[PDB]
Amino acid sequence: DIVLTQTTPTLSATIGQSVSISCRSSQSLLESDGNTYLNWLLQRPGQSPQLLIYSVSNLESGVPNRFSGSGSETDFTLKISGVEAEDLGVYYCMQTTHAPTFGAGTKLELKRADAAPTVSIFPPSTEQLATGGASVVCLMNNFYPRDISVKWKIDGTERRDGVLDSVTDQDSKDSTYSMSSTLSLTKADYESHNLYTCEVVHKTSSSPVVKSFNR
Amino acid sequence: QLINTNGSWHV
Amino acid sequence: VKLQESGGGLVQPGRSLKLSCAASGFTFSDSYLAWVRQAPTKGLEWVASITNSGGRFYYRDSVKGRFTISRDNAKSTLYLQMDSLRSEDTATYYCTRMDYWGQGTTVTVSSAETTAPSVYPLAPSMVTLGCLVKGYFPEPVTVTWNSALSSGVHTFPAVLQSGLYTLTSSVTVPSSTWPSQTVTCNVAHPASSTKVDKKIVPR
């Protein structure tokens, strides 16, 4: 099977900047007919894939001239000359020379000024604890860049087990990210400890952001 | 040029 | 050109499903078509493809023996018979001519049954309040605040826990607003035909 590799999974750009998305193929994509069957697709948030360029370099009808493709037989590049808001999405390279395969995608997000997270810790509700379960929630709202690290400490010692993360898509209004971390525990286990701590590490601060509660 | 409709992978 | 998938829905493993693709605006009998699926963990995938008049077709190794592609040129429809469905087949299904794609049809395969969510409150210049939406299946759930309150709303993507989905929704309001004013989340799960309203009461 042919492997299409998109080296950079995420690309940050400002409106008007030129960008290049690369795709590398494990074997030559040049077919017996002299044609190289490499296509480039854009998937905008909440929409279905859309064809931008076919056969390495051919622009599809209705696609703006800022899009262009080039490549060898194993190395392929999509170029956006002055990115626009409508260009934000995920870009997929794709081949049909061999059994068809897709690359893993390049997220084209928008570069904006660094923003620090707003951290909020929440203890489990008594109605939840009234059942077997207990969930401790930590929210990191409106932060940029996407890159962040959350750590759960229970009475000092880190807890890896039962932690589940979720990061929203980049915001429509402010271009930020917001993350939620839930630590699922049992009522008896939750009651065995005293201090619950959520520690957030982001580039906007040297020291971590620490939000705690006892009970 | 869109798809290799004549690809040897077909059955 | 226009392409319209249908046939998607929830099924248990082993069950069968038949999708269809309504086509218009082009000469369907001259066009080569494909079925492309999009799973979270697997990414984009070529499922099956067929030739303009028939004659040649293709099925990825994962779907050989279970899936069947076909077309009715007189009716301008493309089809995919998916028999012996697995959790691995869970994805959104696209009917495509490469240059033109349809809106898709989602296919969910699971042993879990339609369960309504259990809603718990998340309470402590600005105040961040929330709703923990636990133990629901399938997706999606619509979360609103006081529907009215839209600015400051963060609905986090669901995560699968023991065959059931869990999400969180938060709202940032000025300290003056709450608790002086009522802050409530409105959680809807169409699959179970449920609406749950949970008033965020200070601890």
Q: What's the CATH code of the domain at A15?
A: 2.60.40.10
Is B8's Cβ below 8 Å from some Cβ in C? no
Nearest to A20 by CA among A75, A62, A79: A79
How far apart are the C-alpha atoms of A211 and C168, rounded to whole Å?
18
Widest Cα–Cα separation across chain A: 72
Residues A9 and A104 in one domain: yes
CATH code matching the domain that covers C112-201, chosen among 3.40.50.2020, 2.60.40.10, 3.30.428.10, 3.90.1150.10 = 2.60.40.10
For B4, the closest of A37, A51, A58 (CB atoms) is: A37
Q: Do B11 and C97 touch (CB under 8 A)?
A: no
Subunits with 3+ C-beta pairs closer than 8 A to A: B, C
DSSP A108-161: EEEP---B--EEEEEPPPHHHHTSSEEEEEEEEEEEBSS--EEEEEETTEE--T
Q: Do B10 and C97 touch (CB under 8 A)?
A: no
In C44-83, the residues whose Cβ lies within 8 Å of chain B are 49, 51-52, 56-59
Subunits with 3+ C-beta pairs closer than 8 A to C: A, B
Chain C residues in contact with A118 by the CB 8 A cut-off are 126, 128, 172
How far apart are the C-alpha atoms of A175 and A12, rounded to whole Å?
11
The total number of structural domains that make up chain A: 2
Q: What does R_g of chain A's alpha carbons equal in angstroms?
A: 23
Domain endpoint, select from A112, A133, A152? A112
3 state SS of A20: strand
For A1, the closest chain B residue by CA position comes to B9
Residue A38: domain span: 1-112
Domain endpoint, select from A97, A112, A127? A112
Residues A72 and A9 in one domain: yes
Q: Do A178 and C156 touch (CB under 8 A)?
A: yes
DSSP C156-173: PPPEEETTEEEEEEEEEE
How is chain C split into domains, by residue range?
1-111, 112-201
Contacting residues for B6 by C-beta, under 8 A, at least 6 apart: A33
Chain B residues in contact with A55 by the CB 8 A cut-off are 1-2
For B6, the closest chain A residue by CA position comes to A97
Q: Do B3 and C57 touch (CB under 8 A)?
A: no
This structure's resolution (Å) is: 2.6
CA distances (Å), A200 to each of A126, A136, C174, in order? Answer: 26, 15, 24
Residues A75 and A173 in one domain: no
* Structural biology method used: X-ray
Residues A156 and A191 in one domain: yes
Q: How many other C-beta atoms can be found within 10 angstroms of the C-beta atom of residue C101?
A: 22
Q: How many other C-beta atoms can be found within 10 angstroms of the C-beta atom of residue C60?
A: 19
User: How far away is chain A from the Cα of B6, in angstroms, using its nearest Cα?
Assistant: 9
**Number of CB pairs, chain A paired with chain B, less than 8 A apart:** 25
Is B4's Cβ below 8 Å from some Cβ in C? no
Extract the runs of DSSP E, i.e. beta strands, from chain A.
4-5, 10-13, 18-25, 38-43, 50-54, 58-59, 67-71, 75-81, 89-95, 101-102, 106-110, 118-122, 133-143, 149-154, 157-158, 163-167, 177-186, 196-201, 209-213
Residues A143 and A197 in one domain: yes
For A100, the closest chain B residue by CA position comes to B9
Q: Do A98 and B7 touch (CB under 8 A)?
A: yes
The CATH code for residues C1-111 is 2.60.40.10
How far apart are the C-alpha atoms of A175 and B11, rounded to whole Å?
47
Which CB contacts under 8 angstroms, 24+ apart, belong to A27-36? A27/A2, A27/A74, A27/A98, A28/A73, A28/A74, A29/A2, A29/A73, A29/A74, A29/A76, A29/A95, A29/A97, A29/A98, A30/A73, A30/A97, A31/A97, A31/B4, A31/B7, A33/B6, A35/B1, A35/B4, A36/A71, A36/A73, A36/A97
Q: Do domains C1-111 and C112-201 have the same CATH topology?
A: yes
